[PDB]
């Protein structure tokens, strides 16, 4: 019986091709009689001016409703016909577009992405429609809390620069955004260099490769052309945004020192010591045995409702750190608590439980990578930020190399004496003072 | 071309350990100097002290 | 080229324990002990039992301790999950390859040789009441649980969420009870992947050898039909309204599946008007608020409920239920194109795959199958199945939905809420 | 019953804070010695020789 080394090694290789387009197409092949399809671009709200934003969100609810080919529902009619799904997301950096389908239906599927990403309608009635679908999705998103504080976090964090715009946009962008802003936006960044096709399940790469050449051949074929913008570095300011609500039963904090880009290496510790403070939930089995100290005390003292740690990954940027939501009598001993952890594992990571946070990560990657759709948005993702797919034996590498020593070295990078970014939502009277959370972030004993 | 605050702050200020090795050093360094220039500030101001005592004394 | 995938493997032992296994040569591995030990095995004396079991997993045990069990498996960054039905508990362990065998131990110790010490079980109690807050801020679970209080005298009648009353009185006695009458060899699967068939039948042979429980799969659920209202004023009306459909198996159950895809299940688009759902045409047609519809499709060993959810404003209920209602009548009536039940069949068909495409997904199909059936049935034989609906199955199917003795659940301001009777 | 402080953690965890306990003692040692104005050690600071005669 084969050992977990053996099975990272006959975990098959991501096959890669460019078009002529730029369009890089992209594939897993497995056994699976099921697949996902779909296409990665290199666009989201950092690409947005303080005009445009909320642009992208606004063309996601668009993408679908109907293009020139197929008129009004009548994708819609097709997708649900062979029995597809058909989703998508936008984030700050990256919109997809994706179809989980049948195998057999990977040509019908590629065509219609195709159609979706090249040919969309932007019916003017269509646009009205969608105006108040988006308002209503606003005042939707400002009840669930954790939204807000992320929202607010990067709103702080990243203060003047197109990073501290949400996705979604202000309001008055949402009943302001014509169809020549949504055009402009499209034609600048809906570009085959920007943008990656890819698949994983039961399909050869060949086929991929002919459906690619057979369907989005003329993108840029003549075209890219004058006016690009790279990604202009955003800025991190050390700041506090505090919105008190006392109407509210739960506070909610997000607190987050500055991460380094996608690209850098180490992130893989970063990952290790977040594993190590870990998450937590009030639906937990183990109070008080839980491995996590975090944890363990905020089950035994009744800290908490939930914690999660955090690492979020930008272009050369990134916010590091912990959000977690609590009663108004228990947010200083949750940060007092939380703060420590990030001091213990700076100065005195032990090696056991570093092991800990290894495996966690290794089980973590492994759990996540298992269907067609987190391996193929896995593909999409990758080939926009890191360029290659990372294989499995890769990762399995640069875990394995992190010690305790290269905890408490990349965890001092990052935590040790630095400003944090910190958002406050809720019943936040008892949330302490910057200068006490700045306090936190060295020890006077080291 | 890195600067000598950043330096001051990355050898010396991280560690809380080395700031009061720092300001210990600092400390005995000063007390010296700055004696040295407020007693000799101090002796310019004045001139009527023991300046005169070169009369008094070695003739014993 | 990947590996050409392995079959899976089959067992059934004398005592009628069955191991099934399966080796995709995957970096981690999946282990699940599936038993016939859900909530309608609970009578009138014991409610909410199966309840504190589910949430009693780390709790002190003959072979490791609470302390242990969770510090063992975090070390190896490895999960151990209870998910029950009304039917089953289903007992699962994740780890890396190398690991299995502290997995196994794990896991064979939780539900074999579990302690329920007095003073473990006493602290444990306040967890029902965090569990069932938490499961209960969806307005579905309320509704769910009522209808199934509605439709049954008897075994699928009890909740899958201990009731209020019972909390803290759930005897160490109870708990012991339960495991010796409902874990047993007869009742049980245990489920491998990514681990050879060798290792899993020694570890069945060795620690799964239990007899003296109970015989087998039900007191046998009596449908009754009926209603339960819950005045909520709650925004949104949720309401359910079922028939008595077809037990898991039978061929019955699979037009019943169709029928469901027919009327509607869940969205296949983002943010899609849903053109080919049958139900949620219908209601759009003469309802301009926002609303929702789904076809409702529950089957079970002995018995099933079939019809349909809907979520509404207060006032428009009575228009959405009655609406939805005539819908399904339309199609009992024999007004059913062949191209719909071909769709449906498409629908059915890419669902199910997709259903088995995880390592959980699998994992727990094969073991609810392992239960239900006492054999693995794969995917080009379950598709065989699916195709054998001809159209009149499912004209059939919602014939006996619109003549059954309904069942009913309502949440929200009932006010234009019909009552069955104005149906 | 101080068996307990005996083991791989806290043979790191010493290792860990050594660097540290001996700077502090740094900071003692050379603050005990400003503090005196001491002698043995003040005489042989090579700057620092204001008493000489």
Same mark, same amino acid.
């Given at each position: 019986?084969?050992?977990?080394?053996?099975?990272?090694?006959?975990?098959?290789?991501?096959?890669?091709?460019?078009?002529?387009?730029?369009?890089?197409?992209?594939?897993?092949?497995?056994?699976?009689?099921?697949? *996902?399809?779909?296409?990665?671009?290199?666009?989201?709200?950092?690409?947005?001016?303080?005009?445009?934003?909320?642009?992208?969100?606004?063309?996601?609810?668009?993408?679908?409703?109907?293009?020139?080919?197929?008129?009004?529902?009548?994708?819609?009619?097709?997708?649900?016909?062979?029995?597809?799904?058909?989703?998508?997301?936008?984030?700050?950096?990256?919109?997809?577009?994706?179809?989980?389908?049948?195998?057999? %239906?990977?040509?019908?599927?590629?065509?219609?992405?195709?159609?979706?990403?090249?040919?969309?309608?932007?019916? %003017?009635?269509?646009?009205?429609?969608?105006?108040?679908?988006?308002?209503?999705?606003?005042?939707?998103?400002?009840?669930?809390?954790?939204?807000?504080?992320?929202?607010?976090?990067?709103?702080?964090?990243?203060?003047?620069?197109?990073?501290?715009?949400?996705?979604?946009?202000?309001?008055?962008?949402?009943?302001?955004?014509?169809?020549?802003?949504?055009?402009?936006?499209?034609?600048?960044?809906?570009?085959?260099?920007?943008?990656?096709? $890819? #698949?994983?399940?039961?399909?050869?790469?060949?086929?991929?490769?002919?459906?690619?050449?057979?369907?989005?051949?003329?993108?840029?074929?003549? /075209?890219?052309?004058?006016?690009?913008?790279?990604?202009?570095?955003?800025?991190?300011?050390?700041?506090?945004?505090?919105?008190?609500?006392?109407? =509210?039963?739960?506070?909610?904090?997000?607190?987050?020192?500055?991460?380094?880009?996608?690209?850098?290496?180490?992130?893989?510790?970063?990952?290790?010591?977040?594993?190590?403070?870990?998450?937590?939930?009030?639906?937990y089995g183990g109070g008080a045995h839980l491995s996590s100290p975090?944890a363990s005390?905020?089950a035994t003292?009744?800290?908490?409702?939930?914690?999660?740690?955090?690492?979020?990954?930008?272009?050369?940027?990134?916010?590091?750190?912990?959000?977690?939501?609590?009663?108004?009598?228990?947010? +200083?001993?949750?940060?007092?608590?939380?703060?420590?952890?990030?001091?213990?594992?700076?100065?005195?990571?032990?090696?056991?439980?570093?092991?800990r946070?290894?495996? &966690? =990560?290794?089980?973590?990657?492994?759990?996540?990578?298992?269907?067609?759709?987190?391996?193929?948005?896995?593909?999409?993702?990758?080939?926009?930020? /890191?360029?290659?797919?990372?294989?499995?034996?890769?990762?399995?590498?640069?875990?394995?190399?992190?010690?305790?020593?290269?905890?408490?070295?990349?965890?001092?990078?990052?935590?040790?004496?630095?400003?944090?970014?910190?958002?406050?939502?809720?019943?936040?009277?008892?949330?302490?003072? /910057?200068?006490?959370?700045?306090?936190?972030?060295?020890? &006077?004993?080291? | 071309?890195?600067?000598? *605050?950043?330096?001051?702050?990355?050898?010396?200020?991280?560690?809380?350990?080395?700031?009061?090795?720092?300001?210990?050093?600092?400390?005995?360094?000063?007390?010296?100097?700055? +004696?040295?220039?407020?007693?000799?500030?101090?002796?310019?101001?004045?001139?009527?002290?023991?300046?005169?005592?070169?009369?008094?004394?070695?003739?014993? | 080229?990947?590996?050409?995938?392995?079959?899976?493997?089959?067992?059934?032992?004398?005592?009628?324990?069955?191991?099934?296994? =399966?080796?995709?040569?995957?970096?981690?591995?999946?282990?699940?002990?599936?038993?016939?030990?859900?909530?309608?095995?609970?009578?009138?004396?014991?409610?909410?039992?199966?309840?504190? &079991?589910?949430?009693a997993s780390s709790l002190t045990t003959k072979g490791a301790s609470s302390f242990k069990i969770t510090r063992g498996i975090e070390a190896?960054?490895?999960?151990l999950?209870? *998910?029950?039905?009304?039917?089953?508990?289903?007992?699962?362990?994740?780890?890396?390859? +190398?690991?299995? %065998?502290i997995?196994?131990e794990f896991?064979?110790n939780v539900?074999?040789?579990p302690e329920?010490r007095?003073w473990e079980?006493?602290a444990l109690?306040?967890?029902?009441?965090?569990?069932?807050?938490?499961?209960?801020?969806?307005?579905?679970?309320?509704?769910?649980?009522?209808?199934?209080?509605?439709?049954?005298?008897?075994?699928?009648?009890?909740?899958?969420?201990?009731?209020?009353?019972?909390?803290?009185?759930?005897?160490?006695?109870?708990?012991?009870?339960?495991?010796?009458?409902?874990?047993?060899?007869?009742?049980?699967?245990?489920?491998?992947?990514?681990?050879?068939?060798?290792?899993?039948?020694?570890?069945?042979?060795?620690?799964?050898?239990?007899?003296?429980?109970?015989?087998?799969?039900?007191?046998?659920?009596?449908?009754?039909?009926?209603?339960?209202?819950?005045?909520?004023?709650?925004?949104?009306?949720?309401?359910?309204?079922?028939?008595?459909?077809?037990?898991?198996?039978?061929?019955?159950?699979?037009?019943?599946?169709?029928?469901?895809?027919?009327?509607?299940? @869940?969205?296949?688009?983002?943010?899609?008007?849903?053109?080919?759902?049958?139900?949620?045409?219908?209601? #759009?047609?003469?309802?301009?608020?926002?609303?929702?519809?789904?076809?409702?499709?529950?089957?079970?060993? %002995?018995?099933?409920?079939?019809?349909?959810?809907?979520?509404?404003?207060?006032?428009?209920?009575?228009?959405?239920?009655?609406?939805?209602?005539?819908?399904?009548?339309?199609?009992?009536?024999?007004?059913?194109?062949?191209?719909?039940?071909?769709?449906?069949?498409?629908?059915?068909?890419?669902?199910?795959?997709?259903?088995?495409?995880?390592?959980?997904?699998?994992?727990?199909?094969?073991?609810?199958?392992? =239960?239900?059936?006492?054999?693995?049935?794969?995917?080009?034989?379950?598709?065989?199945?699916?195709?054998?609906?001809?159209? $009149? +199955?499912?004209?059939?199917?919602?014939?006996?939905?619109?003549?059954?003795?309904?069942?009913?659940?309502?949440?929200?301001?009932?006010?234009?809420?019909?009552?069955?009777?104005?149906? | 019953?101080?068996?307990?402080?005996? @083991?791989?953690?806290?043979?790191?965890?010493?290792?860990?804070?050594?660097? *540290?306990?001996? &700077?502090?003692?740094?900071?003692?040692?050379?603050?005990?010695?400003?503090?005196?104005?001491?002698?043995?050690?003040?005489?042989?600071?090579?700057?620092?020789?204001?008493?000489?005669?």
């Amino acid at each position: 019986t084969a050992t977990y080394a053996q099975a990272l090694q006959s975990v098959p290789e991501t096959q890669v091709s460019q078009l002529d387009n730029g369009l890089r197409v992209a594939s897993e092949q497995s056994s699976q009689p099921t697949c *996902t399809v779909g296409v990665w671009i290199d666009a989201g709200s950092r690409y947005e001016s303080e005009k445009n934003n909320g642009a992208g969100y606004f063309v996601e609810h668009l993408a679908f409703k109907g293009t020139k080919n197929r008129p009004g529902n009548a994708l819609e009619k097709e997708v649900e016909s062979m029995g597809a799904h058909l989703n998508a997301y936008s984030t700050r950096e990256h919109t997809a577009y994706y179809i989980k389908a049948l195998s057999k %239906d990977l040509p019908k599927a590629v065509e219609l992405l195709a159609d979706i990403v090249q040919n969309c309608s932007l019916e %003017d009635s269509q646009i009205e429609k969608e105006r108040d679908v988006i308002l209503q999705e606003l005042q939707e998103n400002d009840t669930s809390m954790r939204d807000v504080v992320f929202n607010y976090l990067h709103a702080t964090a990243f203060q003047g620069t197109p990073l501290a715009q949400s996705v979604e946009g202000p309001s008055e962008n949402v009943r302001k955004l014509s169809r020549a802003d949504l055009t402009e936006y499209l034609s600048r960044h809906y570009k085959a260099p920007r943008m990656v096709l $890819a #698949a994983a399940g039961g399909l050869e790469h060949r086929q991929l490769l002919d459906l690619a050449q057979k369907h989005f051949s003329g993108l840029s074929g003549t /075209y890219d052309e004058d006016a690009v913008p790279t990604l202009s570095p955003c800025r991190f300011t050390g700041s506090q945004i505090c919105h008190r609500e006392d109407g =509210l039963p739960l506070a909610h904090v997000a607190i987050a020192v500055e991460g380094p880009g996608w690209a850098h290496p180490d992130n893989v510790a970063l990952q290790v010591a977040n594993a190590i403070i870990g998450h937590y939930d009030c639906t937990y089995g183990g109070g008080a045995h839980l491995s996590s100290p975090l944890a363990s005390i905020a089950a035994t003292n009744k800290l908490c409702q939930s914690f999660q740690t955090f690492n979020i990954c930008y272009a050369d940027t990134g916010l590091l750190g912990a959000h977690f939501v609590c009663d108004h009598m228990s947010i +200083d001993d949750m940060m007092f608590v939380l703060q420590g952890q990030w001091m213990r594992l700076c100065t005195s990571a032990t090696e056991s439980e570093v092991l800990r946070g290894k495996n &966690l =990560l290794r089980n973590a990657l492994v759990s996540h990578l298992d269907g067609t759709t987190p391996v193929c948005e896995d593909i999409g993702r990758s080939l926009l930020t /890191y360029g290659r797919r990372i294989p499995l034996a890769e990762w399995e590498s640069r875990i394995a190399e992190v010690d305790a020593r290269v905890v408490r070295e990349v965890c001092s990078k990052y935590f040790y004496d630095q400003c944090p970014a910190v958002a406050g939502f809720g019943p936040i009277e008892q949330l302490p003072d /910057y200068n006490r959370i700045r306090s936190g972030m060295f020890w &006077l004993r080291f | 071309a890195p600067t000598l *605050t950043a330096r001051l702050y990355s050898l010396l200020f991280r560690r809380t350990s080395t700031f009061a090795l720092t300001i210990v050093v600092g400390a005995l360094f000063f007390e010296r100097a700055f +004696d040295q220039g407020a007693d000799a500030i101090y002796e310019h101001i004045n001139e009527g002290k023991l300046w005169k005592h070169i009369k008094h004394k070695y003739e014993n | 080229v990947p590996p050409h995938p392995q079959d899976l493997e089959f067992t059934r032992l004398p005592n009628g324990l069955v191991i099934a296994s =399966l080796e995709n040569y995957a970096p981690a591995s999946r282990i699940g002990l599936f038993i016939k030990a859900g909530s309608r095995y609970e009578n009138s004396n014991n409610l909410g039992t199966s309840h504190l &079991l589910r949430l009693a997993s780390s709790l002190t045990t003959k072979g490791a301790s609470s302390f242990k069990i969770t510090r063992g498996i975090e070390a190896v960054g490895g999960k151990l999950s209870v *998910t029950s039905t009304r039917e089953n508990m289903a007992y699962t362990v994740e780890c890396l390859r +190398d690991d299995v %065998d502290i997995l196994m131990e794990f896991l064979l110790n939780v539900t074999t040789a579990p302690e329920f010490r007095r003073w473990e079980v006493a602290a444990l109690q306040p967890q029902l009441r965090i569990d069932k807050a938490v499961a209960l801020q969806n307005p579905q679970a309320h509704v769910i649980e009522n209808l199934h209080a509605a439709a049954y005298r008897n075994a699928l009648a009890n909740s899958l969420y201990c009731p209020d009353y019972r909390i803290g009185k759930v005897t160490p006695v109870e708990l012991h009870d339960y495991v010796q009458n409902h874990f047993t060899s007869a009742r049980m699967a245990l489920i491998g992947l990514g681990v050879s068939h060798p290792v899993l039948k020694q570890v069945a042979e060795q620690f799964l050898n239990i007899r003296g429980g109970l015989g087998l799969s039900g007191a046998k659920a009596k449908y009754h039909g009926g209603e339960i209202r819950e005045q909520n004023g709650d925004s949104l009306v949720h309401a359910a309204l079922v028939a008595e459909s077809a037990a898991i198996g039978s061929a019955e159950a699979n037009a019943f599946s169709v029928l469901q895809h027919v009327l509607g299940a @869940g969205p296949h688009v983002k943010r899609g008007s849903n053109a080919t759902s049958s139900l949620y045409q219908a209601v #759009a047609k003469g309802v301009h608020q926002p609303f929702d519809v789904s076809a409702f499709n529950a089957s079970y060993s %002995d018995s099933g409920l079939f019809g349909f959810y809907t979520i509404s404003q207060a006032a428009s209920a009575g228009d959405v239920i009655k609406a939805a209602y005539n819908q399904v009548k339309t199609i009992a009536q024999g007004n059913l194109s062949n191209p719909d039940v071909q769709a449906a069949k498409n629908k059915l068909k890419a669902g199910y795959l997709m259903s088995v495409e995880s390592s959980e997904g699998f994992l727990d199909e094969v073991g609810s199958q392992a =239960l239900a059936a006492g054999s693995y049935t794969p995917p080009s034989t379950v598709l065989q199945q699916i195709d054998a609906v001809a159209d $009149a +199955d499912v004209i059939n199917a919602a014939k006996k939905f619109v003549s059954g003795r309904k069942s009913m659940a309502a949440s929200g301001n009932l006010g234009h809420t019909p009552f069955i009777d104005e149906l | 019953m101080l068996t307990r402080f005996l @083991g791989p953690r806290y043979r790191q965890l010493a290792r860990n804070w050594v660097p *540290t306990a001996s &700077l502090w003692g740094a900071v003692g040692a050379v603050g005990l010695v400003w503090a005196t104005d001491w002698r043995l050690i003040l005489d042989w600071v090579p700057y620092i020789n204001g008493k000489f005669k």
